Symmetry: C2
């Protein structure tokens, strides 16, 4: 028995990141874990607790104010009810919008540290995913 627990990203300004993931994406702070002896702080955020959800781990390294992104790591994707409305709320709050489709299926937005977040209409994505599994013999 195995489970995906979380994805970790490093952030330059911990409070700014927390504000984005909570106020703009509707996550809740689950817990924090400061390790001053090794000069870092962890915070876990998600839509439910780690015991029943896969969550986001932020790492702040003392004195490291910003990060450069490679061409390797992609993104996290979040399933939502209304992509158009959520994107509208992001723009209202000056979040960069990298991509927005016409139909409201998909968008990409940029977090305060420059990471990409994919927003998906959960209902449409799941219908598609199940359909493709059934076509490919995995469901």
């Amino acid at each position: 028995s195995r489970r995906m627990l979380h994805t970790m990203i490093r952030v330059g300004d911990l409070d700014r990141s927390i504000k984005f993931y909570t106020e703009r994406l509707g996550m809740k702070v689950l817990r924090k874990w400061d390790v001053p002896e090794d000069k870092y702080t962890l915070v876990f955020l998600g839509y439910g607790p780690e015991m029943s959800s896969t969550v986001l781990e932020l790492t702040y390294n003392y004195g490291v104010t910003s990060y450069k992104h490679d061409e390797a790591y992609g993104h996290i994707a979040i399933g939502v009810e209304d992509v158009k409305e959520l994107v509208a709320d992001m723009r209202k709050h000056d979040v960069p919008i990298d991509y927005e489709d016409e139909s409201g299926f998909m968008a990409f937005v940029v977090d305060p540290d420059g990471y990409y977040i994919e927003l998906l209409n959960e209902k449409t994505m799941m219908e598609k995913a199940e359909a493709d599994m059934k076509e490919q013999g995995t469901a």
Copy 2:
């Protein structure tokens, strides 16, 4: 209602990545999405279907066989029953072991493209998460 759906990483060689995540980590291939005209392939893997699980998405760009890594993106963490037993099994198959504690709580291994994976004893992790949440007043 919102949910973390997946994390995406780009990989140099689908065959070797799929071998690692299935044979070494116990995930299953859920579905593929191949777009020859746009020169890419996506593969979704996980411990359960996208409908009930947060999964891993691999993107292969045709003819791109290596990715260099930033120190921004962290890792994905996977909860297991026996870290030591796994790490052993991994070391048998020449998987790089970056870190392994004495207690059996935590280890870090490296996937074929150089991404880090955190292996955690899930029981212990969740006990700790629960106690931290209660102490911090978020539970």
